[PDB]
Design a protein around this ligand. Structure first.
Ligand SMILES: Cc1cc2nc3c(=O)[nH]c(=O)nc-3n(C[C@H](O)[C@H](O)[C@H](O)COP(=O)(O)OP(=O)(O)OC[C@H]3O[C@@H](n4cnc5c(N)ncnc54)[C@H](O)[C@@H]3O)c2cc1C
Ligand SMILES: Cc1cc2nc3c(=O)[nH]c(=O)nc-3n(C[C@H](O)[C@H](O)[C@H](O)COP(=O)(O)OP(=O)(O)OC[C@H]3O[C@@H](n4cnc5c(N)ncnc54)[C@H](O)[C@@H]3O)c2cc1C
Lengths: 577, 577, 104, 52
């Protein structure tokens, strides 16, 4: 606990870790604070799904997700309980109870929006989908030069993909994956392209995928250390970062005010460079607590002096979901190359195929797995191996289908009736819509109500914009219904539905990027530097100013890489002493 | 990783950690293996509830519990889903699907029984209640000398309480605690004693309790290290211990067969002393997989050669539960000492009390809290401060009320309608019955079906015995209904109910202790040494042979401490070269 | 708005209503027992196409009402059971029970 | 309610739902025996369960 660093980073999620990786590597003396604690094992900030227990029982992982997510704004509860005993203490009003937010209009919320406070942030639990944005979803980095803009994005995305270990081959020999992939490819031939969802993941064995995280980007070990004797990094968990201190001119940050949650002590930390990577909600909260924007209910009669676009133009994706149960036709197709003789459980039962036969609909690797499963498990009625990995299919956002898609499996809490259905049959469908940025859609903070860390209580004023956003969301629902029917019918209890607003956790635009503060209604420039401030940078999805359907983290990381490039050219590391 | 140690311990739960603490401390070269992995932060095997985020949001902790608990035996699912699309594939039978156990009679199960595979075992999520057993619940350690038996238990319990940091003071200044404690004390004046639940925990601040765990017993750091330079200890996570190898004479164990789940390598580990502390279920599995007892469906026409009582006489407690919403009478009594002038929210609202006065019903510390709450939070209709800790009350098992009681709060997933009720009002009631050991109540292992780690699948054959156990269980339900009514009426949605059998996770008797193998129908003696074997010891609740209602961990720990005494008297540590 | 789309089901010999020779119903009559599945082929394909059609057509009017999402109803809840004593021209050739005057 | 009150299910298969939270004192089945008007002839997977 020096009090002076070259760079201080608030937040140890994947974005904070991008800044760490770049700046620690470039020889800056870096400190990183997180309000949360170390709890991913020996690999700090690593993916919680990479334990043998969760690789064996993936659905239990829903619990890890739920256990770390804390709802951002919960309106006052007006449910009537009228079967209490007459002796029990009973309210005469729906008073402010149980951490509810009386500022929150229940009908203009993102009720699903939640935050994670743990070392590694949400990347300890995320699904690892890292697609690039096409031009239509993507903010500009170069004006009046589409080719230059493309090249820059390519360069940035490629590095970000390297940091995350993004690939598209980790499920290449899954039967379920290829069954779905091939069918959809055929069904949409000449109309849409399908591929594996790009995933931040490395396959380690047929039954183990090492999912990427913040740890993948930067290992979060203090430095100097044996492997990095000339680097300087300290991570300080359980430290609430409360305020960045503005100079009177509003041109520089002079310190970061922190609160050690274990000792209870408050301190001021000095750095040359201050980077806020606390998430799209908490970066906004930290800035508002530091005198940027406006505390309290927005009043257009009284616009704020600093960053008037902060907390406006917020975007969150519409999400539709269902599950399907694989069609009989597709299941039968799995064993199309098999010659089946005799009868199961008997000496006479024979399942064979001819490797390499040109009439085969499937490759040998597929037929071998099918044949062995069927020969070794004659009591089982399905041709899919027990350990066959899940599907990981997408058709990426295009103008004619302006939503992201994931046709896959992830952790899910199946009801007991749904557990009646063999897991091999089940596919999850998640289509993600883009949301137009609108000034009226706001994240603001109470001047009266405080959250669990005694900070101004976040409050949403949000509706999905009329027009394109709403039309496309409904069009997306329909496209899901149509596309999913090609694979199988809906699983009862997982019927097509919109998910609770914000449950997606793809919130953007809360501290949005643009070329010109006024003209582009924005808060940071393309170096992620806060307008007017020499030494204050914001990283994360809050930077993204566009309507996007694809998962935003890779894009946010790309912007952070670019930000680091500016930092490297404008600030000098202290000499290593 | 040598393959020769003085002592090898299977399992890193609190009972394995008792053996580690004692034997590492006595100078033995110790290896400990756990099939699970490190996932409590930098403190290896520590309580997962000891993060600032879970102390702020206790109810989220139910997710941690759920995430780690894996059902022991799930019967084949026969739920009819008859609203699938006609195109979806369906089986014609309720086939073995989804890890279900076809051996399992769904009507003679402990369906709620589950196991945890993580470093620190279940002690990374337990409730920390550590009562002693009275004589009626307690196995004898001394024959025909009640006062000597008492003395021995007292010595061992006192040490166990020290290892766990058990205390009865961590909630002493909770308003809610004292409200409930005082009321029940008065209601049962001269009939029952109430006190704080003895809890393995240390309060660190008014809003933080450091709950104990395996880490508390033994920090699980490899030794030698700077703080323990003469000690020798290695922990090897993600290692499945599969079997112990018996000599032909069945007088000694010769090695421990392990499978490293990360590398995939298998080793035979040699030690002088083999200690199995894998839990009541997995100790049993390991022993059966090693040729103790009998594999397969019990057949009494072919009793097994070794440990014929292994996996018989199993006990699990009956558990009844409800929640209550505090009576109006009790809530009003909180503010009994207050003089209230004016209307709240208005100008000259005043709430006052006289410090140290004799007609005061409450202590100054209480009235000061109440006053400051009522005054600083005039919008709130309750007199209980917002950060008041929860109740932690018990009346311990006695012959006239032969159940354990906990009248308290722990993590709970409230429905949205239940979240309508102010949490300060709610109290959980859990009463725990004792179950008679009966030979017919069995844990056995399939000779064909295997579990997720390719080990013989555990199967229960369990019913609560008729007679005393069942009568007491029903009497206990009535008692809860009677007693809870003194505090408030039932909370809707948490009405009085029996919990699913085994959800309690207090299974005992699977490898039970006694003086004489045949006469006492048992597997280990009072040193926890397996009959016939010089150098094999079992630790845990599986040792407890009695019908007990109180939480068993402290009792198992006490047994382990006695076991370690035997080891120190019979095995010499290797010289530390 | 409620949306109910009804498919047609191919008549198949294997789909039967039969009556127990042991179990009786509430009026002491032979207990009815079904042996029924929706036929593979046209019936099943059309059923799924029908679901999709409902999804597509309904979206023109509004989104789904939560709790009344697109679903197949329990088989027979419709109560449009047919063919148990079916009509045709020739008893044998048309596998039937009554002629076109509904005469047995 | 009128519709439900009049409709009587044609064939209800034997119920195999497990209730394992009965009190230990309550009488409990060792099998899923023919109970409550159910039809043991009926394959639950080849029914028109909604027929009434
Ligand atoms: C279940 C799940 C599935 C997801 N799936 C995907 C996916 O497939 N693809 C994808 O692109 N994204 C997905 N996401 C989103 C993704 O995880 C986030 O976009 C990403 O983690 C954001 O990174 P970040 O570093 O900006 O913020 P975060 O990961 O939120 O990290 C921010 C951090 O700052 C901390 N912090 C907050 N406030 C303070 C404060 N005042 N002081 C100090 N520290 C503070 C936190 O404790 C935290 O660790 C998913 C998220 C979840 C939870
Ligand atoms: C939610 C919860 C609440 C509880 N509340 C209480 C309470 O208040 N008081 C109380 O007394 N008890 C309580 N318990 C029970 C208590 O946690 C257990 O009694 C105690 O942890 C048992 O300790 P143990 O060391 O014998 O076994 P465990 O804690 O089960 O540890 C055994 C270990 O062995 C490992 N293992 C298993 N198989 C193998 C193998 N083949 N090879 C290598 N390792 C293996 C595991 O991975 C594990 O870590 C609670 C438990 C739960 C989960």
């Amino acid at each position: 606990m020096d009090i002076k660093y070259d760079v201080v980073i608030v937040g140890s999620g994947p974005i904070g870790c991008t800044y760490a990786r770049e700046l620690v590597g470039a020889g800056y003396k870096v400190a990183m604070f997180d309000i949360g604690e170390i709890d991913s094992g020996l690999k700090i900030g690593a993916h919680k799904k990479n334990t043998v227990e969760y690789q064996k029982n993936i659905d239990k992982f829903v619990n890890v997700i739920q256990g770390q997510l804390m709802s951002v704004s919960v309106p006052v509860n007006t449910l009537v309980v009228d079967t209490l005993s007459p002796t029990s203490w009973q309210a005469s009003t729906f008073f402010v109870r149980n951490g509810s937010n009386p500022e929150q209009d229940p009908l203009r919320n993102l009720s699903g929006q939640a935050v994670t406070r743990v070392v590694g942030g949400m990347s300890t639990a995320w699904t690892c989908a890292t697609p690039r944005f096409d031009r239509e979803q993507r903010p500009l980095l170069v004006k009046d030069d589409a080719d230059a803009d493309d090249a820059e994005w390519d360069r940035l995305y490629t590095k970000a993909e390297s940091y995350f270990q993004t690939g598209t081959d980790q499920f290449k020999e899954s039967i379920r994956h290829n069954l779905v992939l091939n069918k959809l490819t055929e069904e949409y031939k000449g109309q849409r392209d399908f591929q594996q969802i790009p995933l931040a993941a490395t396959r380690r064995s047929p039954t183990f995928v090492e999912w990427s995280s913040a740890n993948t980007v930067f290992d979060l070990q203090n430095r100097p250390n044996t492997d990095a004797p000339e680097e300087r990094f300290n991570l300080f968990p359980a430290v609430a970062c409360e305020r960045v201190v503005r100079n009177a001119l509003n041109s520089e940050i002079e310190s970061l005010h922190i609160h050690d949650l274990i000792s209870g002590d408050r301190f001021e930390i000095k750095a040359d460079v201050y980077v806020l990577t606390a998430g799209a909600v908490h970066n906004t909260q930290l800035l508002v607590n530091s005198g940027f924007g406006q505390l309290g209910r927005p009043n257009p009669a009284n616009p704020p002096e600093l960053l008037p676009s902060l907390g406006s133009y917020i975007t969150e994706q519409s999400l539709v979901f269902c599950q399907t149960v694989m069609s009989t036709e597709l299941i039968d197709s799995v064993k199309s190359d098999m010659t089946i003789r005799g009868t199961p459980g008997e000496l006479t039962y024979s399942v064979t195929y001819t490797p390499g036969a040109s009439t085969n609909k499937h490759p040998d690797w597929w037929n071998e797995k099918v044949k062995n499963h069927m020969m070794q498990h004659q009591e089982d009625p399905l041709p899919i191996p027990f350990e066959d990995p899940e599907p990981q299919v997408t058709t990426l956002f295009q103008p004619s289908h302006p939503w992201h898609t994931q046709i896959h499996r992830d952790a899910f809490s199946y009801g007991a009736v749904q557990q009646s259905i063999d897991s091999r049959l089940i596919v999850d469908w998640r289509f993600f819509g883009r949301t137009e940025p609108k000034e009226e859609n706001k994240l603001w903070f109470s001047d009266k109500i405080t959250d669990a860390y005694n900070m101004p209580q976040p409050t949403f004023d949000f509706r999905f914009p009329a027009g394109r956003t709403s039309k496309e969301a409904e069009d997306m629902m329909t496209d899901m219904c149509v596309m999913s029917a090609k694979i199988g019918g809906f699983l009862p209890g997982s019927l097509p539905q919109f998910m609770e607003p914000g449950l997606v956790l793809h919130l953007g635009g809360t501290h949005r990027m643009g070329f010109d503060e006024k003209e582009d209604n924005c808060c940071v420039n393309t170096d992620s530097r806060v307008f007017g401030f020499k030494n204050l940078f914001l990283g994360g999805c809050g930077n993204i100013p566009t309507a996007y359907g694809a998962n935003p983290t890779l894009t946010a990381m790309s912007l952070a890489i670019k930000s680091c490039e500016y930092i490297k050219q404008n600030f000098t590391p202290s000499p290593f002493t």
